[model samples]
Target: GPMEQLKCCSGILKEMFAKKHAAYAWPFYKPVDVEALGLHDYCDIIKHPMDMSTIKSKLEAREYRDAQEFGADVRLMFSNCYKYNPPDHEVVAMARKLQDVFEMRFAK
Candidate 1:
């Protein structure tokens, strides 16, 4: 049953990212390149990096055992954004909105 729920939740995530106003999702679509971006302090602050692409790959590989596990990673993505960016940063704002939308949809 958990796997079935994960399947459904995975589809929900896919659809969410596919939305028309998904410009905010761009920053979170792939792994953050701390080195390339010269964010040397990033690794020290963010122990676990997350992104939609990684999540999708994990889902495809069945690394997630349940919907909650998948949800945790999604939340982690937002959490990482918040932790790494200033509160008023545009990306932080986008992350907050996206997280809200994700919670609402995931709860349904």
Candidate 2:
């Protein structure tokens, strides 16, 4: 499920900081951490244009026991940049726009 995917991504992000928060205190310093996070591998999926289909499916099907979780996942896309270092500006731009669009359309 999408929730599991998001959680896995979040888990890896947390793992990075847990491994050595101080090492990556600043994003500019390269190597080791960035290489390990391997966000680039997931960037393809991350770059998937955020369509309303997933959100629509969840809400429409009542897939979530608590409706709040659905909205939280949508919002998480906006602020989860912590996991993405050395983000290609263009990709991030797309991501930002998608996040904004989802929030605007659904206010989620």
Candidate 3:
């Protein structure tokens, strides 16, 4: 349980970092003082930390939920259809169950 919690927590942090990193970019032209002065106002504008524990956590939780709902539906579609003919309708029963499991486990 502890390790799974850590993994889920890490997913949130990973999402935060991915978004922040993708938000940043470097200039094509060179400024001579760049090495000495390092990042400046321009850099600060491009890069910054996101607080997942802040008000945005509500939005993050919603995003995570949407992912779960959609992911389970997609997985269920393909996983069940791997069989022939009319498709395996029985698998859909447990698909919603696992979706609820993730929504409960991660969105807490």
Candidate 4:
């Protein structure tokens, strides 16, 4: 009605992230950096003084892995998709769903 399907999704994520969500809301959608829905940042990764750097590296490792898994770059966004933020499995599944629509249509 107003814009399109893509921008509508952007509006939702920004609003949702702004609100708060549980720890590891999705794969890469963890708003755990601050305080969200009910989860705290993965602060545990950086607690131990001696292990701070090690743990931080570990944290960064996982973050980096997930970034690639979810198709997010260092900036954490889908280039072909709308908006400029990271995505998670939900987004992946949605893409599959769209594929299914076309796939099934062509199959028929």
TM-scores, one per candidate: 0.92, 0.37, 0.24, 0.21
Candidate 1 C-alpha error for residue 101, in Å: 1.8
**Per-residue lDDT of model 1, residues 1-108, tens digit only:** 987898888887787678653877788888999878568898999999999999999999999999899999999999999998889989998888778778888998
Candidate 3 stretches with Cα past 4 Å from truth are 1-6, 9-88
lDDT computed for candidate 1 = 0.87
Best by lDDT: 1
Top candidate when judged by TM-score against the true structure = 1
The models' CA-based lDDT, in order, is 0.87, 0.43, 0.36, 0.32
Evaluate model 4: give its lDDT. Answer: 0.32
lDDT tens string, model 4, 1-108? 223332333333333233243222233332224365423533443231221123234344554233222112312222222132235535554434333432343333
Candidate 3's residue-wise lDDT over 59-79, tens digit each?
344543444443343333333
What would the per-residue lDDT of candidate 2 be over residues 21-56, giving only the tens digit for each residue? 433322321222224545546454354322234444
The list of candidate 4 runs beyond 4 A from truth reads 22-27, 30-108
* Candidates sorted on TM-score, descending: 1, 2, 3, 4
Clashes in each model (backbone N, CA, C under 3 Å)?
0, 0, 0, 1
What's the lDDT of the predicted structure labeled candidate 2? 0.43
Deviation (Å) of 35 in candidate 4: 25
After superposing candidate 1, which stretches have Cα over 4 Å from the reference? none
Worst 10 residues of 3 by lDDT: 25-34
